Motif scaffolding. Structure first.
Motif, PDB file in Angstrom:
ATOM      1  N   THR A   1       0.831  -1.195   0.000  1.00 60.37           N
ATOM      2  CA  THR A   1       0.000   0.000   0.000  1.00 60.37           C
ATOM      3  C   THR A   1       0.871   1.252   0.000  1.00 60.37           C
ATOM      4  O   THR A   1       2.067   1.188   0.297  1.00 60.37           O
ATOM      5  N   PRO A   2       0.295   2.409  -0.335  1.00 58.47           N
ATOM      6  CA  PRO A   2       1.062   3.656  -0.188  1.00 58.47           C
ATOM      7  C   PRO A   2       1.606   3.851   1.215  1.00 58.47           C
ATOM      8  O   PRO A   2       2.747   4.301   1.381  1.00 58.47           O
ATOM      9  N   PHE A   3       0.824   3.500   2.238  1.00 54.86           N
ATOM     10  CA  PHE A   3       1.328   3.599   3.603  1.00 54.86           C
ATOM     11  C   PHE A   3       2.474   2.619   3.841  1.00 54.86           C
ATOM     12  O   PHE A   3       3.452   2.958   4.519  1.00 54.86           O
ATOM     13  N   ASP A   4       2.374   1.405   3.289  1.00 51.40           N
ATOM     14  CA  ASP A   4       3.468   0.441   3.394  1.00 51.40           C
ATOM     15  C   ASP A   4       4.774   1.017   2.868  1.00 51.40           C
ATOM     16  O   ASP A   4       5.835   0.832   3.477  1.00 51.40           O
ATOM     17  N   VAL A   5       4.720   1.700   1.723  1.00 47.40           N
ATOM     18  CA  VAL A   5       5.934   2.259   1.139  1.00 47.40           C
ATOM     19  C   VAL A   5       6.511   3.338   2.045  1.00 47.40           C
ATOM     20  O   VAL A   5       7.708   3.336   2.355  1.00 47.40           O
ATOM     21  N   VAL A   6       5.667   4.274   2.484  1.00 45.67           N
ATOM     22  CA  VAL A   6       6.130   5.351   3.356  1.00 45.67           C
ATOM     23  C   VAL A   6       6.744   4.775   4.627  1.00 45.67           C
ATOM     24  O   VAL A   6       7.824   5.196   5.058  1.00 45.67           O
ATOM     25  N   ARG A   7       6.078   3.782   5.229  1.00 46.10           N
ATOM     26  CA  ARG A   7       6.614   3.127   6.421  1.00 46.10           C
ATOM     27  C   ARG A   7       8.017   2.590   6.176  1.00 46.10           C
ATOM     28  O   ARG A   7       8.942   2.848   6.955  1.00 46.10           O
ATOM     29  N   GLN A   8       8.189   1.819   5.105  1.00 49.56           N
ATOM     30  CA  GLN A   8       9.468   1.157   4.885  1.00 49.56           C
ATOM     31  C   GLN A   8      10.539   2.147   4.449  1.00 49.56           C
ATOM     32  O   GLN A   8      11.707   2.015   4.832  1.00 49.56           O
ATOM     33  N   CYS A   9      10.165   3.150   3.654  1.00 47.65           N
ATOM     34  CA  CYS A   9      11.152   4.108   3.174  1.00 47.65           C
ATOM     35  C   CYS A   9      11.497   5.178   4.202  1.00 47.65           C
ATOM     36  O   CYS A   9      12.516   5.852   4.043  1.00 47.65           O
ATOM     37  N   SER A  10      10.691   5.344   5.250  1.00 48.85           N
ATOM     38  CA  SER A  10      10.969   6.327   6.289  1.00 48.85           C
ATOM     39  C   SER A  10      11.334   5.703   7.630  1.00 48.85           C
ATOM     40  O   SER A  10      11.610   6.439   8.582  1.00 48.85           O
ATOM     41  N   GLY A  11      11.334   4.377   7.736  1.00 45.99           N
ATOM     42  CA  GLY A  11      11.756   3.718   8.963  1.00 45.99           C
ATOM     43  C   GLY A  11      10.780   3.820  10.116  1.00 45.99           C
ATOM     44  O   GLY A  11      11.205   3.972  11.269  1.00 45.99           O
ATOM     45  N   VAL A  12       9.477   3.731   9.836  1.00 47.72           N
ATOM     46  CA  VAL A  12       8.478   3.770  10.899  1.00 47.72           C
ATOM     47  C   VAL A  12       8.656   2.561  11.804  1.00 47.72           C
ATOM     48  O   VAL A  12       8.745   1.419  11.334  1.00 47.72           O
TER      49      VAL A  12
END
Lengths: 11, 306
Positions: free
Chosen positions: B292-303
């Motif tokens: 998902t878009p949230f999945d990408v942001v999470r992985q690319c920003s280190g959530v």
């Protein structure tokens, strides 16, 4: 196909 | 950099898994506070499964017929009820490892982690998506029913899936934690078939943004398109229609990369029409739609999670 309910047999 | 199909850390869920046995049948249950949730098919024999009348089968079951095992300890069942397709087994001990948790019914296109268990013990963890046809492409064997799918936000586990059954083409169906199946499926051994396996368009676009962020840029072309023209091409490829809501959800990734969503749609359109020419994107030879878009942001920003 028929759906298969993936419970297991009691051991 | 790099980009992997990444599951949530499973520790919070591992401490909730128990084994539930009834009659000649065993599967997994989810122990939260003083309730154990499990598929109602635990009360079925193999012959029951062709045409079960669950209410009638339940008449002959008492609290003591449900054997609940957490490790080498038996929990004491002091009540039971059936809610839709799950049983709720009230036990006399609150799970001391219960995390902060919610029950959520996810939308198709959303993703979650599965903790695959057998006999109340975990075998592994992997990421899944609720497909547009309401199946998931999991990895489950006999005994895996009752394994759950979940998301984590900060310190709170959102349970969204409990596994029940396997369908032809090797895909899987199950319920939310209120016992309602995703999609039209029923917990009986009858001819059931998944609908068209539609591709989650907004997720493919999110993953193309992930590729750009990682420097995989060969597929960026010199084009843009419109929502209506893109959907015209993508319908032929069994892609979900892209809506303005999807475009807005991609806003964070569009702003990070400076690539308008409709520009990325034009690049996706050429990939659909002309193929990938044997090239790879983020190490994959096909277009991945389970981020998902949230999945990408999470992985690319280190959530991280607490």
């Amino acid at each position: 196909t028929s759906a298969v309910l993936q419970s297991g047999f009691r051991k | 950099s790099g980009f992997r199909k990444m599951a949530f850390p499973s520790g919070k869920v591992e401490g909730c898994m128990v084994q539930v046995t009834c009659g000649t049948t065993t599967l997994n249950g989810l122990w939260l506070d003083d309730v154990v949730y499990c598929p109602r098919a635990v009360i079925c024999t193999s012959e029951d499964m062709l045409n079960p009348n669950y209410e009638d089968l339940l008449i002959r079951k008492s609290n003591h017929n449900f054997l609940v095992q957490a490790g080498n300890v038996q929990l004491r069942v002091i009540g039971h009820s059936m809610q839709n397709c799950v049983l709720k087994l009230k036990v006399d001990t609150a799970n001391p490892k219960t995390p902060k948790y919610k029950f959520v019914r996810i939308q198709p296109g959303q993703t979650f982690s599965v903790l695959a268990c057998y006999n109340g013990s975990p075998s592994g963890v992997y990421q899944c998506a609720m497909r547009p046809n309401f199946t998931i492409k999991g990895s489950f064997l006999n005994g895996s029913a009752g394994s759950v799918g979940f998301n984590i936000d900060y310190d709170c586990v959102s349970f969204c899936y409990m596994h029940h059954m396997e369908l032809p083409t090797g895909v899987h169906a199950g319920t939310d934690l209120e016992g309602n199946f995703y999609g039209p499926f029923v917990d009986r051994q009858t001819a059931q078939a998944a609908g068209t396996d539609t591709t989650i368009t907004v997720n493919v676009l999110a993953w193309l943004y992930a590729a750009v962020i990682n420097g995989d840029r060969w597929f960026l072309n010199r084009f843009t398109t419109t929502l209506n023209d893109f959907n015209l091409v993508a319908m032929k490829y069994n892609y979900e229609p892209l809506t303005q809501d999807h475009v807005d959800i991609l806003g964070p990734l569009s702003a990070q990369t400076g690539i308008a969503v409709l520009d990325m749609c034009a690049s996706l359109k050429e990939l659909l029409q002309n193929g990938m020419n044997g090239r790879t994107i983020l190490g994959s030879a096909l277009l991945e739609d389970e981020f998902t878009p949230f999945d990408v942001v999470r992985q690319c920003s280190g959530v991280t999670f607490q």
